[PDB]
Design a protein around this nucleic acid. Structure first.
Ligand SMILES: [Mg+2]
Ligand SMILES: [Mg+2]
Ligand SMILES: [Mg+2]
Ligand SMILES: [Mg+2]
Ligand SMILES: [Mg+2]
Ligand SMILES: [Mg+2]
Ligand SMILES: [Mg+2]
Ligand SMILES: [Mg+2]
Ligand SMILES: [Mg+2]
Ligand SMILES: [Mg+2]
Ligand SMILES: [Mg+2]
Ligand SMILES: [Mg+2]
Ligand SMILES: [Mg+2]
Ligand SMILES: [Mg+2]
Ligand SMILES: [Mg+2]
Ligand SMILES: [Mg+2]
Ligand SMILES: [Mg+2]
Ligand SMILES: [Mg+2]
Ligand SMILES: [Mg+2]
Ligand SMILES: [Mg+2]
Ligand SMILES: [Mg+2]
Ligand SMILES: [Mg+2]
Ligand SMILES: [Mg+2]
Ligand SMILES: [Mg+2]
Ligand SMILES: [Mg+2]
Ligand SMILES: [Mg+2]
Ligand SMILES: [Mg+2]
Ligand SMILES: [Mg+2]
Ligand SMILES: [Mg+2]
Ligand SMILES: [Mg+2]
Ligand SMILES: [Mg+2]
Ligand SMILES: [Mg+2]
Ligand SMILES: [Mg+2]
Ligand SMILES: [Mg+2]
Lengths: 167, 260, 131, 188, 155
RNA sequence: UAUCUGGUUGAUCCUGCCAGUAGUCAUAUGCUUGUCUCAAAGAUUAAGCCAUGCAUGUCUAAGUAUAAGCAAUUUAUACAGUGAAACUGCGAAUGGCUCAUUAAAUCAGUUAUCGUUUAUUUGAUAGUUCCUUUACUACAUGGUAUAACUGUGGUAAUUCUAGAGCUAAUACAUGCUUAAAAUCUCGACCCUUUGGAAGAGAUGUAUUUAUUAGAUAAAAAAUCAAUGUCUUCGGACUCUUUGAUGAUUCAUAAUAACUUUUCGAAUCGCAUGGCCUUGUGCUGGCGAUGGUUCAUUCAAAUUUCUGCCCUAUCAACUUUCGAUGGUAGGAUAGUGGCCUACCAUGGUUUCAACGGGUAACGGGGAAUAAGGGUUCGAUUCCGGAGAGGGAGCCUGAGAAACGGCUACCA
RNA sequence: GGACUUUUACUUUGAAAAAAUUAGAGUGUUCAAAGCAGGCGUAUUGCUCGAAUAUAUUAGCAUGGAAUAAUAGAAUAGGACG
RNA sequence: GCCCGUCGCUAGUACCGAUUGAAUGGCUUAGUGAGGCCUCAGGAUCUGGGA
């Protein structure tokens, strides 16, 4: 049952050290590496199963393969991905082209759609308006308190020359 | 040993909490905050052990989560949040306000204060540096950064603060003859004026203190917290005004009030 | 990891084990106040022993010294409370005196007998232990 | 790991110390960047508590400052000619702080003759006026001006390449320049 | 030990960031920096007047003096630029209610502003670790030479 | 709570030990055992070995739901309740346990960081992002590639997983933006002066280097090179601005540049209101999660002074292959022979070094009660060390982690 | 703020100081070992005393003393004040 | 009367001692040297020089 592993070369097994983002290993823990056996990528009589993928079709239909066609499971969910699984130009409105999957509640047929993300909406623009606001507002605030301080200083100098001219 | 310690064994807990020996194993460990672990009074201690308001610890979270309790003006929801000397504890319901201020036995007192007095606090400025952009700042004993203070403000002076807004409305310089509250050592909670400081370059200036019983005693500077003029304190002091009576004196007073 | 439950023992035992004089002297005490143990005498003579120790130490200090005046007076008022020390002899040079029978005389078993109620000191024991 | 503890190592008396505890990581050390010349190639090492150091291995340019002229340019680093710690750094042209290098001069030349209108070695309006302002100030220095013919200048790496990813320095000048020249030739 | 040479290393000896612009014709060749260590310790003139470099000098170099201030009695002036003093002290032993002579040697750096020699009493100041063993820096000589000059030929 | 007694002789007085006597938070064992309360407990020998179960997981209105999940109703045809799985985040460095090592080590009391790193909590903190700056850059918001899942499978076997097909973000990877002003360098022109000028670029923070300011020990003058502001055109400069420390090349700022360019919100929940030129325009409430820098708090690492049991049937020790110091570097979070290269010859010791032993973790403390002492502390709190023995390392703020991984040994 | 100070031991008083343990105050856990409680009323919408003190010695710090015991001083004057 | 040593018996302890005897633990020369980490290369594939 040990698996093949692209790009070992070798037609035998070996025991490698694997990491995150790698074939034949799912790390149980962060930073976990485990040392596991692996089968090489060169095919040999010892293989229980070869994994093949049709690239171009032959001259005649293959039973449960070319003759049957299982559909995708899920459809576009991010705003622009809808705009491209239909080709839409951001003017067409995406709420309409979202996919709809019927389903039965015995004698009630219900209907559900995703939840478009990255959807530009008024609610989002209200927040982009507010952040911008807050920086400027603060920036001006921070200047006044600055200027107000210079005053405390500049009319402290007008008291050090009311001191140095009294005595 | 590998990292921050997250528990507090009872007995390792500071005494001025007055936690009982048995009935557990641990005490609450004061969260990271504005006051130091060893000089703080967690909410759990205050809402339960002092005010008797909740019985369960669990019940203290239930009181708290309703945003009943609020410290120095802000709501505060942490069970073990570190409350500290000079802070202000308000109960919206029960219309009660409290200041955290020391006994004489060195303990945190339960001390009711007005709705008005609860508007502001006092802070010992602990350092005064020149910040970035050249903006000067002061930093007070409860970790407040206040930008743009008075030049005449320097380290050890105490400071009046709006709470409601973060600002400074006043300051008192550390000068021979200014009301002092002692915050550390076995003279913690004593109160009285200042006679004169010993200098000592490269270690621990000494602050010679005298109260309103013509009593005298010393502490390290660091442990001295200015709070007004003799007479005029900028906050209300706890009953007994931190004067410290002899064991005999105390005995006598208590067996003086004897006749029911 | 839970706080030590503190405890103390409350007796001392005769240095010399077979002193015929001490032995008789102890029995009569029992026979008189209705004790069952030598320990009931032992326990008391231990209580006594410390009090003397306390008092002895105090006396060494200066007359009108704070601790002496504080804790000395405390010790006196407490002995008075139970009626071991008489009112006249109220100054600890006498708590320094003070024999065991004084203590003995103030037990609930002994008082329950002294005026009425019991008639014989043993009947006194049994009544008490019997609610 | 390399461990910068003291608890190996004999006591001042010269006694042998037992081992007490194992290597902690907080007393760790790592290996030398041994940074060389040519082509950018820098690797970041993750140091204590977040925090990167940039380990330069191979470098070809650095930013070099002509102190007395109060400017700094980017130049090629022609490369290592003297090093007080170990000569293998010189023979292997290795870049570390304190190393004496050779830089390029073409940026420092272009600046000068543009700022002074004088040209080293051997008609605008404002510029003319500007140049006339300066001078009596362009009188440079015998043993620096002569380096420009060669098109190479002596400079002292002042930064830390295996730490900061930078190989920066100042041109050599006056007294200190006199030093390294004397060593350079009285060794030649 | 320093003595003479001064520019005597593989590297050029200088005070960091103390730049002498060659363009500006100067009458002192080298701009030289120095501080006042503090705690009322005079920075001696030989520090300012000198031309040695020594980055471990508490007046001309990059060290702060803070912590203990210690005084001992010089015992070793064999190692270049650092000395070793003996700190004598009597140790109290309760059961016998008497004392016994003890001592410790303490290695300490010594700036060529001072010229110290065996027998001299020296006040030294605690600083950051300067070497494997040295944690102090010498800051005032209390001594002199121990009446050496009155040891010449016959009358 | 300052006590002694029995035994050498024929008898005597001594010396002197053996024996008795009393306690032990001091273990075992024997016999005996009714009640209240209190409650230690596989330390000692073997830090020997371990069957099986359990001891670390975690969700708020508020990161991610098309469960082909449950519930239906209640406005909700993008989504909206509830919610497995999974991603993402945070935690697993706390706790608990043991005393093997350890004898200037640990530890204690006392110091230091002007010698560093610090998730978090708390408080401060960001108008600068583009481009030779009119035929313009997605901001009404830019890219895919993946779990779960569906489906095809492999092995006797495990918290093994392969080939195929989908789809999300506060995961991954990108990438726009805002007032005014001043100061700088350039400089087309015109005109000879005392010379001045349109307009052009550059200036967030962070990084790295070099430079400069950061005064003050009480007062005054002349001259060289540049070159400021105001002219009563010989000239004057009149008031001139300064933070902290015992102490700094400190805090902070200024100049010329540097960077495979750090940060500068493409995020989420509640409410939905004003406002006119009616653009679904432009505005706008409360608070979540973020975010760079500084402070604070929880810490950490090193660190000064002094103090340790027996031992000379251990007297010299230390530099092989660093032993003690200097210079430079490298490495580190950072000091430092920590490591390297050059160079030197130093460092410790009868005031006991160095070596050996320890049935040695250090401390708070425990037992014994005239006092002085003597003995003990594996063990409820504090510190340290470890996880069968060694070494190594990934993740991370923090581990040289063991209920993490890698290798060797058993 | 400048300019400079012969060294030490001893003793004094003081600061800095974890708790539990120890000594010890207050409180009738029914007694007691303990515990840090508890106590008063209008016992129907509360009043109130507490949670002391001592010790903590060596070393380091800070202060007073000037006996006891060391130390250094001016003799080839290279002396002291100006 | 006391009493000393060889010589003889039982039993016990420790010593010397061919075996260049044995065992456990701590360091350690020389040789061999796993592994991860750093680094010179590499390039299954998978994209815009990088990974
Ligand atoms: Mg979204
Ligand atoms: Mg907590
Ligand atoms: Mg300090
Ligand atoms: Mg030497
Ligand atoms: Mg006999
Ligand atoms: Mg006889
Ligand atoms: Mg006879
Ligand atoms: Mg005996
Ligand atoms: Mg045990
Ligand atoms: Mg065991
Ligand atoms: Mg749903
Ligand atoms: Mg632990
Ligand atoms: Mg991709
Ligand atoms: Mg991100
Ligand atoms: Mg000046
Ligand atoms: Mg200043
Ligand atoms: Mg700086
Ligand atoms: Mg609207
Ligand atoms: Mg031997
Ligand atoms: Mg060195
Ligand atoms: Mg030698
Ligand atoms: Mg000896
Ligand atoms: Mg041991
Ligand atoms: Mg021990
Ligand atoms: Mg112990
Ligand atoms: Mg043991
Ligand atoms: Mg460990
Ligand atoms: Mg085991
Ligand atoms: Mg080994
Ligand atoms: Mg491990
Ligand atoms: Mg563990
Ligand atoms: Mg004292
Ligand atoms: Mg106490
Ligand atoms: Mg390398």
């Amino acid at each position: 049952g040990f698996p093949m592993k692209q790009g070992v070369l070798l037609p035998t097994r070996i025991k490698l050290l694997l990491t995150k983002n790698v074939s034949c290993y799912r790390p149980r823990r962060d930073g976990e590496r485990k040392r596991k056996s692996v089968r090489g990528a060169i095919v040999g009589p010892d293989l229980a199963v070869l994994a093949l993928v049709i690239v171009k079709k032959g001259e005649q239909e293959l039973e449960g393969l070319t003759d049957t066609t299982v559909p995708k499971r899920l459809g576009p969910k991010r705003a622009n991905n809808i705009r491209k699984f239909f080709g839409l130009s951001k003017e067409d409105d995406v709420r309409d082209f979202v996919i709809r999957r019927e389903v039965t509640k015995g004698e009630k047929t219900y209907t559900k759609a995703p939840k478009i993300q990255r959807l530009v909406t008024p609610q989002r623009l209200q927040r982009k308006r507010h952040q911008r606001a807050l920086k400027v507002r603060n920036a001006q605030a921070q200047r006044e308190a600055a200027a107000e301080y210079a005053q405390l200083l500049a009319k402290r100098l007008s008291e050090r020359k009311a001191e140095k001219a009294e005595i | 040993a590998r990292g921050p310690k997250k528990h507090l064994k009872r007995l390792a807990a500071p005494h001025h909490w007055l936690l009982d020996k048995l009935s557990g194993c641990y005490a609450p460990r004061p969260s990271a905050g504005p006051h130091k672990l060893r000089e703080s009074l967690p909410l759990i201690v205050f809402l339960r052990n002092r005010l008797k308001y909740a019985l369960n610890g669990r019940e203290v979270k239930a009181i708290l989560m309703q945003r009943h309790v609020k410290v120095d003006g802000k709501v505060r929801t942490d069970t073990t949040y570190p409350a500290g000397f000079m802070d202000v504890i308000t109960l919206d319901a029960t219309n009660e306000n409290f200041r955290l201020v020391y006994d004489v036995k060195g303990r945190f007192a339960v001390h009711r204060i007005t709705d008005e007095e609860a508007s502001y606090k006092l802070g010992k400025v602990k350092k005064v540096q020149l910040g970035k952009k050249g903006v000067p700042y002061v930093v007070t004993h409860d970790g407040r950064t206040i930008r743009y203070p008075d030049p005449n403000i320097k380290v050890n002076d105490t400071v009046k603060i709006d709470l409601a807004s973060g600002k400074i409305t006043d300051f008192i310089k550390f000068d021979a003859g200014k009301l002092v509250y002692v915050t550390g050592g076995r003279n913690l909670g004593r109160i009285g004026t200042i006679v004169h400081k010993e200098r000592h370059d490269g270690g621990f200036d000494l602050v010679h203190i005298k109260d309103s019983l013509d009593n005298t005693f010393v502490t390290r500077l660091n442990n001295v917290f200015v709070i007004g003029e003799q007479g005029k304190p900028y906050i209300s002091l706890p009953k007994g005004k931190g004067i410290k009576l002899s064991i005999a004196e105390e005995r006598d007073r208590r067996r003086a009030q004897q006749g029911l | 990891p839970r706080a030590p439950r503190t405890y103390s023992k409350t007796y001392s035992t005769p240095k010399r084990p077979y002193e015929s004089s001490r032995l008789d002297a102890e029995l009569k005490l029992a026979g008189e106040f209705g004790l069952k143990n030598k320990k009931e005498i032992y326990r008391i003579s231990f209580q006594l022993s410390k009090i003397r120790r306390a008092a002895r130490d105090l006396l060494t200090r200066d007359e009108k010294d704070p601790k002496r005046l504080f804790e000395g007076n405390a010790l006196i008022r407490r002995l008075v409370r139970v009626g071991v020390l008489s009112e006249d002899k109220k100054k600890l040079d006498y708590v320094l005196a003070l024999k065991v029978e004084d203590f003995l005389e103030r037990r609930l078993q002994t008082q329950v007998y002294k005026l009425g109620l019991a008639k014989s000191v043993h009947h006194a024991r049994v009544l008490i232990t019997q609610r | 790991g390399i461990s910068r503890d003291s608890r190996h190592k004999r006591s001042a008396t010269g006694a042998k110390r037992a081992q007490f505890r194992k290597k902690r990581k907080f007393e760790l050390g790592r290996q030398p960047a041994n940074t060389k010349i040519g082509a950018k190639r820098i690797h970041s090492v993750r140091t204590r508590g977040g925090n990167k150091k940039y380990r330069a291995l191979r470098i070809e340019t650095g930013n070099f400052s002509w102190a007395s002229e109060g400017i700094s340019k980017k130049t090629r680093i022609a490369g290592v000619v003297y090093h007080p710690s170990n000569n293998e750094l010189v023979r292997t042209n290795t870049l570390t702080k304190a190393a004496i290098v050779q830089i390029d001069a073409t940026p420092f030349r272009q600046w000068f003759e543009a700022h002074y209108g004088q040209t080293l070695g051997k008609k605008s309006k404002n510029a003319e006026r500007k140049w006339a302002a300066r001078a009596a100030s362009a009188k440079i220095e015998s043993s620096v001006e002569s380096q420009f013919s060669a098109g190479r200048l002596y400079a002292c790496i002042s930064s830390r390449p295996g730490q900061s990813g930078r190989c920066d320095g100042y041109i050599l000048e006056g007294e200190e320049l006199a030093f390294y020249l004397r060593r350079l030739t009285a060794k030649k | 030990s320093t003595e003479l040479t001064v520019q005597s290393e593989r590297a050029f000896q200088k005070q960091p960031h103390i730049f002498n612009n060659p363009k500006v014709k100067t009458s002192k060749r080298t701009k030289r920096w120095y501080k006042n260590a503090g705690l009322g310790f005079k920075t001696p003139k030989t520090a300012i007047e000198g031309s040695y470099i020594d980055k471990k000098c508490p007046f001309t170099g990059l060290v702060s003096i803070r912590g203990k201030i210690l005084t001992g009695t010089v015992v070793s002036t064999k190692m270049h630029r650092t000395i070793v003093i003996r700190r004598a002290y009597l140790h109290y032993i309760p059961k016998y209610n008497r004392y016994e002579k003890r001592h410790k040697n303490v290695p300490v750096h010594v700036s060529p502003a001072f010229r110290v020699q065996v027998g001299d009493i020296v006040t030294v100041g605690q600083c950051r670790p300067i070497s494997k063993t040295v944690r102090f820096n010498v800051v005032k000589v209390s001594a002199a030479a121990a009446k050496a000059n009155k040891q010449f030929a016959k009358f």
